[PDB]
Design a protein around this ligand. Structure first.
Ligand SMILES: CNc1nc2cc3nc[nH]c(=O)c3cc2[nH]1
Ligand SMILES: CNc1nc2cc3nc[nH]c(=O)c3cc2[nH]1
Ligand SMILES: [Zn+2]
Ligand SMILES: [Zn+2]
Lengths: 354, 354
């Protein structure tokens, strides 16, 4: 197993399916990464996370930087050991959740990269400035330029550290707001520095699906075709399908977990609010076709009662189902792309989903 | 499999070990019943409850009477089906958590018994009045007398209902506060009416272990030897050991679950507060010898972080460990009684535990 290898097995238009091989395992693309807020995927054991099909999880750096702090986790063996997940982990840089050229008061590109190293990240994100939406062309440019300088410092910091450089991968992040010329300049700078993967940053921050898809339309072709394309913070099932149609390989979102705990369940016929009185005596599973263990064993009526009663098992079951749903979605995307029927899949999906 | 069969395999002094056979399964005695507050054992899937060794759970009636109410659960197939636990369930009568000769305003003996039927209880508790502690002899007597009349009405109500009478068991509850003559009168009345099992009520309500053990000393021999003896609401590991020494066969308590969520873990060397700073970098499992899955896989330091962070996985892991601990305790009790070394076990236990 190499440090990092991305291989594309099949394509359909801009859509791709393939694999990322890393020392800790293989990642099927297009991939959905369950988000791990504070060294845990909320309300699930990692074995359950794995059981639903996840190949990789996202380790949120922000909360851990502060508690228990990255040096203690290092001391204890690294995040993998700590939380009991032995497969790849993608870590964020911490800046999103958190100002000068050096960094953010004190987190700078160098420190973010070190913290991700201390955590034992497999995929390290460059430290950037995610431009607020909307942004004037001037601010978007200044932000993007800074992020590209921070992008270079991230690379150098990553490269300085032998063990990191030899066992982990580094992804760069494109910025530029909604402006084509900036996105292109950003793509060029990132390509020039060179990364194992390229994220599309600055989206999923208030623009609406229509605008997001439009920026993806011109932005994703700007990134090296031969490397994974990661859309940060996205999103709804229909967001994901449309972004794959636009060439995105990787996703993360708190929706399935967080929405799960609030009572929202994803189904092929669209999302439902299990708290709604209409489900009080409904003996059907959350979704008719879902193959997850929750859907094999418990009814809507039971999960309705649990969530309304504030019971922890309610959060557990809703969360397991939602993450399972998302992975089933990703599998459906992968299969349909391999088979050259992804466009039909996307239309069929949106037709039933809405 | 019969409706109810209690068979004693071995004895040591007042201690006994054996089995209760019921249609939904076999129960190893002395038995600990995890408590199911609102159609769930908080933060655990029933398969996990089973995996830790529980043979039977306690279904709390009180919360369900109100929501979702016993008729809806009936409609949905009964509690077993609803929460996914196919093994025996002992239901309380609801009165403890909740005044006239008819009942409590409106829950009476007849209604409690019907509600337990609607839930599909395997072991039905007679509706009583648990005497506050301390009580004057006069009040204790009046309370006990009422409970015995309610005990008779419970039996008749249970017996009126064919399906209940043929598939479920009924336990009576001894009262009498700390007074020998009352306990005896109560034992006699209950024996006279006749039950499948006898609980010792009125304890675990403020008296302190010393007083409780003293009342058990004279009270448990008053109950039919050939039927299970259930100490309601007890308790700490050392409570349980001493009560088995006094002839108790059955226990329930919220301690392992509730204490678990608050950060208290049970160990053979006594209880610990995993929140304590001293466990921040402790890579040992919660307990050195515990065979549960939590202790096989996660460290004290990790569970320390989770509980402090308010994470749901923290409640899940603490709860799984504690219930596992309790079942291991019960297994140790059973084995040592069979082998005629329970007294040594109890001394060894208390020696290390304190
Ligand atoms: C939920 N939407 C969303 N989450 C994001 C996280 C990000 N991190 C780094 N850089 C980003 O541009 C960025 C954009 C994001 N949008
Ligand atoms: C935690 N202590 C405790 N929980 C109890 C529940 C009870 N239910 C019915 N009857 C009782 O006498 C009774 C006594 C109890 N003590
Ligand atoms: Zn499901
Ligand atoms: Zn354990």
């Amino acid at each position: 197993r190499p440090r990092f290898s991305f291989s594309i097995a099949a394509r359909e238009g801009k859509a791709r399916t393939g694999t990322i091989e890393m020392k800790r395992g293989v990642i099927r693309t297009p991939a959905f990464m369950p988000v791990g807020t504070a060294a845990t995927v909320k309300a699930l054991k990692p074995e359950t996370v794995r059981a639903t099909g996840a190949d990789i999880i996202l380790g949120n750096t922000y909360h851990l930087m502060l508690r228990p702090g990255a040096e203690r986790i290092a001391k204890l063996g690294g995040l993998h050991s700590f939380m009991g997940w032995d497969r790849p982990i993608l870590t964020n840089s911490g800046g999103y959740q958190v100002q000068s050229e050096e960094g953010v008061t004190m987190l700078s590109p160098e420190r973010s990269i070190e913290i991700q190293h201390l955590l034992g990240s497999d995929i390290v994100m460059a430290f950037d400035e995610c431009t607020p939406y909307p942004a004037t062309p001037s601010r978007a440019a200044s932000s993007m330029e800074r992020s590209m300088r921070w992008a270079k410092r991230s690379r150098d910091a990553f490269d300085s550290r032998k063990e990191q450089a030899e066992n982990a991968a580094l992804f760069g992040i494109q910025q530029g707001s909604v402006f084509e010329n900036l996105r292109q300049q950003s793509a060029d700078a990132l390509a020039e520095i060179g990364f194992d993967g390229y994220a599309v940053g600055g989206l999923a921050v208030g623009e609406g699906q229509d605008e997001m898809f439009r920026v993806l339309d011109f932005s994703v072709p700007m990134l090296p075709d031969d490397k994974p394309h990661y859309l940060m913070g996205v999103g709804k099932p229909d967001d994901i399908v449309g972004a794959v149609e636009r060439g995105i390989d990787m996703f993360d979102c708190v929706l399935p977990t967080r929405s799960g705990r609030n009572g929202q369940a994803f189904t092929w016929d669209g999302p439902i609010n299990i708290r709604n009185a209409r489900f009080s005596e409904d003996l059907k599973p959350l979704d008719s076709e879902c193959h997850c263990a929750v859907c094999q064993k418990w009814s809507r009526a039971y999960i309705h009662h649990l969530i309304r009663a504030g019971e922890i098992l309610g959060a557990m079951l809703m969360t397991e189902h939602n993450i399972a749903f998302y992975q089933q979605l990703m599998q459906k995307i992968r299969d349909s792309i391999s088979e050259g029927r992804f466009s039909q899949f996307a239309q069929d999906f949106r037709a039933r989903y809405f």
